[PDB]
Amino acid sequence: STPADRARLLIKKIGPKKVSLHGGDYERWKSVSRVSTEEIDVLVKIFPNYALWIASGSIAPEVGQTSPDYDEANLNL
Amino acid sequence: STPADRARLLIKKIGPKKVSLHGGDYERWKSVSRVSTEEIDVLVKIFPNYALWIASGSIAPEVGQTSPDYDEANLNL
Incomplete structure (x- = not known):
């Protein structure tokens, strides 16, 4: 995988609301x-x-750096 | 600062050798x-x-994540 x-x-997960609240252009995003x-x-x-x-593709939950899959996997734990 | x-x-610090060893195009890099x-x-x-x-602009040396200034500052320490 690459950056x-x-x-x-x-990006596929986010919609116009969060994009626009953080300063992005949705038409490009889409x-x-x-x-x-x-x-x-x-x-x-x-x-x-x-x-x-x-x-990088790495995580470091020790310092609050995770991933979408990690966060989902860590919900019911 | 931004990414x-x-x-x-x-990029300003790296020359053609390291770029080409890691798969980049120097003419664009330059x-x-x-x-x-x-x-x-x-x-x-x-x-x-x-x-x-x-x-992000953050570091986390706890997990090996630093910065150019941190590494230089941490040489003689």
């Missing part, structure tokens, strides 16, 4: 769902806990 | 020094310890 793949996965640095900035704003995962 | 600003700072997702992938490959900082 673009992981960003795109998150078609991206290629990925730009702008989209990474907005994603980090929406999900500060996903910064490390977007960039 | 692009922090990537650009690193002019970037706007930033693309591709450049983030290569930067994370060159500096896996800078993934969190590029994406």
Whole structure:
């Protein structure tokens, strides 16, 4: 996986409300769902806990850095 | 600062050798020094310890995530 793949996965999950609250352009967002640095900035704003995962594919819950799958998996635990 | 600003700072520091060893295109790299997702992938490959900082501006040395200034500041310590 690449930073673009992981960003795109998150982007597919977000709708216009969260995008616009964090300063992104939805019409670009909609078609991206290629990925730009702008989209990474907005994603980090929406999900500060996903910064490390977007960039590297790694997590570090020790410091609050997780993933969408980790957070879902960690709900009922 | 944005992810692009922090990537650009690193990009200015790297030359053709490290870029090409990690799969980037230097001619694009040279002019970037706007930033693309591709450049983030290569930067994370060159500096896996800078993934969190590029994406968010935060560090987490607890898990090996630092910054160029942190690493320099932590040399003689």
